[PDB]
Design a protein around this ligand. Sequence first.
Ligand SMILES: Cc1cc2nc3c(=O)[nH]c(=O)nc-3n(C[C@H](O)[C@H](O)[C@H](O)COP(=O)(O)OP(=O)(O)OC[C@H]3O[C@@H](n4cnc5c(N)ncnc54)[C@H](O)[C@@H]3O)c2cc1C
Ligand SMILES: Cc1cc2nc3c(=O)[nH]c(=O)nc-3n(C[C@H](O)[C@H](O)[C@H](O)COP(=O)(O)OP(=O)(O)OC[C@H]3O[C@@H](n4cnc5c(N)ncnc54)[C@H](O)[C@@H]3O)c2cc1C
Ligand SMILES: Cc1cc(S(=O)(=O)N(C)CC(=O)Nc2ccc3c(c2)OCCN3C2COC2)c2[nH]c(C#N)cc2c1
Ligand SMILES: Cc1cc(S(=O)(=O)N(C)CC(=O)Nc2ccc3c(c2)OCCN3C2COC2)c2[nH]c(C#N)cc2c1
Lengths: 464, 464
Amino acid sequence: MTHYDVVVLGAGPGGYVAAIRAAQLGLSTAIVEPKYWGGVCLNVGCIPSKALLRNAELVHIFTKDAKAFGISGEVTFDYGIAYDRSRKVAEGRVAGVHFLMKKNKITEIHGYGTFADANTLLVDLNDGGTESVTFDNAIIATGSSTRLVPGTSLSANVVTYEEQILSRELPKSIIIAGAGAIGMEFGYVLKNYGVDVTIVEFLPRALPNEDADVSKEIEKQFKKLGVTILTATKVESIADGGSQVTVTVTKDGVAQELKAEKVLQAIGFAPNVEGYGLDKAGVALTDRKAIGVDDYMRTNVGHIYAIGDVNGLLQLAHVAEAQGVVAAETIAGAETLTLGDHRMLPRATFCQPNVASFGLTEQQARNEGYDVVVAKFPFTANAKAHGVGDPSGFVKLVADAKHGELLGGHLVGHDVAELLPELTLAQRWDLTASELARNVHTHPTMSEALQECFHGLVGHMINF
Amino acid sequence: MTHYDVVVLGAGPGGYVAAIRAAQLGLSTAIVEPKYWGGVCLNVGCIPSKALLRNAELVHIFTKDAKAFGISGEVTFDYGIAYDRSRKVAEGRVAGVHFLMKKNKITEIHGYGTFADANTLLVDLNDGGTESVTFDNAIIATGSSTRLVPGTSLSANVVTYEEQILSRELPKSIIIAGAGAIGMEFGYVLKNYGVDVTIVEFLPRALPNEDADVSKEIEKQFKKLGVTILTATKVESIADGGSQVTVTVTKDGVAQELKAEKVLQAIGFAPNVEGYGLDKAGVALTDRKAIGVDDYMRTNVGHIYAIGDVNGLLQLAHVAEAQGVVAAETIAGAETLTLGDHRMLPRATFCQPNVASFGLTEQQARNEGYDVVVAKFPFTANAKAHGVGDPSGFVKLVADAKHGELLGGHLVGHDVAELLPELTLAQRWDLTASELARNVHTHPTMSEALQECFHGLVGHMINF
Ligand SMILES: Cc1cc2nc3c(=O)[nH]c(=O)nc-3n(C[C@H](O)[C@H](O)[C@H](O)COP(=O)(O)OP(=O)(O)OC[C@H]3O[C@@H](n4cnc5c(N)ncnc54)[C@H](O)[C@@H]3O)c2cc1C
Ligand SMILES: Cc1cc2nc3c(=O)[nH]c(=O)nc-3n(C[C@H](O)[C@H](O)[C@H](O)COP(=O)(O)OP(=O)(O)OC[C@H]3O[C@@H](n4cnc5c(N)ncnc54)[C@H](O)[C@@H]3O)c2cc1C
Ligand SMILES: Cc1cc(S(=O)(=O)N(C)CC(=O)Nc2ccc3c(c2)OCCN3C2COC2)c2[nH]c(C#N)cc2c1
Ligand SMILES: Cc1cc(S(=O)(=O)N(C)CC(=O)Nc2ccc3c(c2)OCCN3C2COC2)c2[nH]c(C#N)cc2c1
């Protein structure tokens, strides 16, 4: 029965960053985690899947583009090796999280935590014992779980992201339910390694959260690659017959049966809020079953905070990091800044070409009452894009006319995920298109296409 | 005879961008160019060499890293195809420059221009005639030429960048004189395609303009790749015997003879200031034989301007673009902003790993009297760098302590050239480490290593 200044529940990107920041500000800190050090992101999420996406990108060059680059010979690819490497990359970052806990003198507690009241946590230890832990403040960072198509269930041939990304062998065909970011990245990896792929989306666009021009471009690329995308289609039933799975879908009111060897459910994530005594601590849920928080990540209980995917605001790893810093600085009384409108935070999809965006789409800005100026620059006019061998996609910026303040930005192209930091820095600190248009960009880079769209917003695009 | 508001001499990155900007501001414009539309950059410089660097990067993956990525089979590479592609990329951008001239109603004049006085230009036409052209203002954008090792001369087996980049065949061995950016990129391409390469630098570091930590890292990578770099060595003589070239060098006062099939002279560039009547117009040269200019690119003659490599300030294509915009806005009387200290402008080297930098090195900032705070973050702590398969290099930021204003930045790693725009935007508009440290970066990207160094400058690096 020991006492800490701050206990952290869960050790993913939000939880372990918050604990470090609380250790930097002088608070005595403990972190409780039963399974994944590094949470979903480092163990079965962002990190391992980027390693697999890199492999898939090279298969797609060393086969589709071989003649163009002067590459000859019979080249084969082993997916087993790609899997072996993704697990070594993951293991290397988990070792990093343990080194960081040790460096900062954070007490790791290996177990599953449950609130006994507003200041007491009862932990069930992995080693078989029990531990009690009183605190002054607590940070809940327990993540989310996979949401299932209503009526269906998991089974041998119906799986979630976790069983797929840990499979060393591939199926002959697969149906992916959901055209979000995670679904498109599994489609992209599996199609490049010879799997027959179909993606079923309920909304009429793939990546329905992106600007409509971005959805149209990415649906064109995926069709070229050979993936079949069925939009405006509803999954009704999933039946696992052992040898194959029959997925019944409806579109335009007509029933249709698809078939594959596997089905991947990837329609979304529900916060984890059950089983660890949130009611004993008095913490209140929202109407969507998330933990409600204010702008400083504080729940309805004054000393309890909730960060990351468990509050549902925006379920990305860097958002969870930023929220944990706010939470920790708020507990210590240090200088902090709120994140603000979570629509302005960046996000990306890491198929090739990448998709990267922030802020409002053109249509969201018109519906909210701004005076909208749009500038669009294609990568066929970018010298670097031609040199790399992939000149597709574009840059599209949305701004307000009265001063030229940035409202959003939407990029599709080769590695565009790296080009967002200039844009979000200008939006957060109130730099206009006039200031941005004066920043000189190294030639030749993909980032020069940003400079061209800055000039377009002030009224004189030069190179297009 | 015919009169224009503005005549532009030379049609490279500076000249053709200035003409477009002068066309946008309402001035009637003519541009005189005998040979290269797009100048050195688009025809035999930046653009074609990036296409060759991309090819070399893929040879280096599909041979050195094949086993790690699960790539098997006998793979051969043809350098002839790489050359064919680099010439198709170049031709495609030259067609772009002509389309832009047509769109903006700029009069192209195909010939070599010579000043007759302060307002008259005599042009010798490629078609064989002569033309006279009076102007109100003139922009000189005539570029630079290769500088030769003192005492040596060009010949069959001793060449400059222009004859090398236009060679479809490769030599068995080559000695590159000069370890600047252009020399290292030719070394990198030729070594990956099986050429035996030696690079002789007079200064004691490779890339002597970079921060010493960047030079040490890049000399390690090149040694690993198999290139021999001789630093603090002086080229004395070059003798072309027909079958081989004997290069006599001295280091520590001891004479030594090297041998190769070819020698590439790549020690620098001298502005072009002879032969086209700069003395008839009254334009004054500096002591280094450049055209002198003030902060608005104006020569000692009130209506004549000089942009790009011909003024010698910083010989890069994007600098030439930025100067042409200033020049054109100054002639039209439009709102303009000077570029300022040219040391703050970004620059990059496009071998793999890239080198990217801006501003002052750590040692330059100490010698100039600042209170220097340094933050260094390695890419072995970057999750994305591990996923791509190249976790080498680092990020190093130099700042001033009193407010945390940025003084410089120095990056070596995979595609880091794209990460400079956030840094130069903060330096030009006076954003401190405190503001930068609040910008959220998409996870996982190479750019997160910037965010870590921002935290290091304000005193709390989290992930390392
Ligand atoms: C395939 C895939 C790819 C993704 N790719 C990206 C990407 O490229 N970029 C991106 O930004 N995001 C990506 N994500 C999302 C990212 O994984 C999550 O947004 C992130 O992990 C959320 O962080 P968190 O710490 O809030 O939650 P988690 O990472 O889920 O952390 C929760 C942790 O708390 C533990 N826990 C739960 N209950 C308790 C309890 N009672 N006591 C103790 N511990 C408990 C859990 O075991 C878990 O380890 C991806 C996700 C998936 C599935
Ligand atoms: C191999 C190589 C790689 C390079 N890579 C890069 C890179 O990655 N990034 C970068 O920023 N820079 C790079 N550079 C440098 C870049 O090419 C130059 O900085 C740039 O071209 C300078 O632009 P400019 O328009 O001032 O000169 P130029 O491009 O040389 O333009 C001068 C033009 O004027 C014409 N001209 C000359 N005299 C007259 C006259 N009397 N009348 C009419 N026309 C005339 C010439 O024919 C020529 O076409 C590279 C250079 C080389 C050689
Ligand atoms: C010095 C330098 C040179 C280049 S550039 O070499 O790429 N170039 C000359 C531009 C170009 O090509 N424009 C163009 C213009 C027209 C077209 C077209 C392309 O594509 C095919 C189609 N058509 C036309 C449009 O109706 C059909 C740069 N690009 C960027 C960026 N971003 C910065 C930059 C800086
Ligand atoms: C959520 C998340 C996760 C990761 S992370 O997965 O990469 N990770 C856990 C950090 C890490 O590994 N630190 C580390 C710590 C130690 C070490 C080491 C590495 O390398 C090998 C050597 N040693 C130690 C140092 O003495 C030997 C992130 N990195 C970035 C950036 N930039 C942002 C980011 C955000």
